[PDB]
Structure formats: structure tokens, C-alpha cells
Design a protein around this ligand. Sequence first.
Ligand SMILES: [Zn+2]
Length: 257
Amino acid sequence: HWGYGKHNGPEHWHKDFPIAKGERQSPVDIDTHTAKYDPSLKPLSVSYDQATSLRILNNGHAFNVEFDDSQDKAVLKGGPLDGTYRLIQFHFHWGSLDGQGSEHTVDKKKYAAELHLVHWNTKYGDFGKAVQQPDGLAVLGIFLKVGSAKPGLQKVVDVLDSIKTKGKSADFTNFDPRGLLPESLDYWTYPGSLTTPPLLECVTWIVLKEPISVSSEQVLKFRKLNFNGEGEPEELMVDNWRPAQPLKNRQIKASFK
Ligand SMILES: [Zn+2]
């Protein structure tokens, strides 16, 4: 099956998922000098006050913090978006070392990790319908650098012991994703894809310029997770990132000067 190893990693995915070589794949390098300020982008609206987290799952590629998306409780709107996108889950991509782990790059700089807050367009009714549409998803991408601890991440770090292996889940209620946001909502935006199979070209990417800081101890706990199932050979869950893909016929827009 697909993964991040020598025999099933990103350079192999195109054999089962030919859209891997498509016209709007993600992630990309963000060339900060070429990105155009777009004075017409509307204000970005992150409304997470009523968010309802339910569960945390190790799916064998990453961990997902899942939300109740059966009503408009946690929504992303404005910026480049038309209409209302509902938070369904967040996950991270990270490295074996602090010098790699992000999927997007900024002037070829790699961050230690990247948070993806996944939202689906309410006009398509559910996530499965939304991923079939070019405007189905909005993913808020946030870079992690290693420095000071992020207090709002520790509740996540402290549950990972309970979901070490593929297929393990744990109750994860009352987690506030506002604790993972940087001060500034200045962003870059472009049309792209899921960065994991099935690599569907359904994402409006919104990548924040300001990283968040996490501690060395916090990312070490991410690196103790396993890709494998319980009672299988231990394979550390590290380097679960796809490298930068060709930009092709796309323009990256900046919300800021
Ligand atoms: Zn992701």
C-alpha cells in the first residue's frame, strides 16, 4: 500500500494515483518574491469558538484530531473563499530531524513540521462529495519551528502514548484548536491538492506566513509514534511529508505587502 518508505513513498504514488503528476498538485515551494499581493482578497475569518473535538486516531500515516462537523460549529470563511467551510480534522506532517518535515517550503526553507486544519465546503453536504469538487476543501497550513513550547499543543502530545500504533484511537474532547494559531493571519493562497493519496485536486490552500514554535520535547513525542500496527515490527512515524511539486500554470497570491 502507499506510504513514505523507499518502496512505497512519494516517487511511487503515481502508479496507483496517476493524478500525482497532475496540473495542480501540492505541496509547492512558495517563492516569496514572485507571490503577488492581491489587495482584493477579503478578510480571513477563523471561527473556532464552538469547535467540538471528539477523537484522535493514528491512521498509519499521521494522527487526525477529529471534530463534530454535523453543524456549523467551527468554520473558515473569507480570504480567497466563497461560502462556508467546516472544520473536520487536523493533522501534522513532520521530520526525523528538525531540518525537515514541512510539505510547503518558503524560498526552499523546510520547517520542522506542518499543521493542516482541514475544512469542507458546506454547499457539497459532506466531505466525500466535497473532495470531488475543485473548490471542495480549504486547508489552513501552519509551519512549526523548534524553539519555545506551544502550551496549546501539550494536550495533543500527552495523548500520543495511547495511540502509538496504526488503527488506535482515543477519546479527545474539549480540545481548542485556537491554541495552535499564530498571532498573524497573513497568508499565501493557491489552488492545489491533498498531499496524500488519493491526491485529489480539490483544495484551496491557505498557508500562514507566521510559524508557531514548539519545543524539542513536543516534536520528539511525534517521532515516537509508529506507522505499524500493534505487534508488528516497529517503524517510527517520521518523514511523513511529500516534497514540493511543480507549480505549473499557477499563481501564489499574498494577503499582505
Ligand atoms: Zn496534510
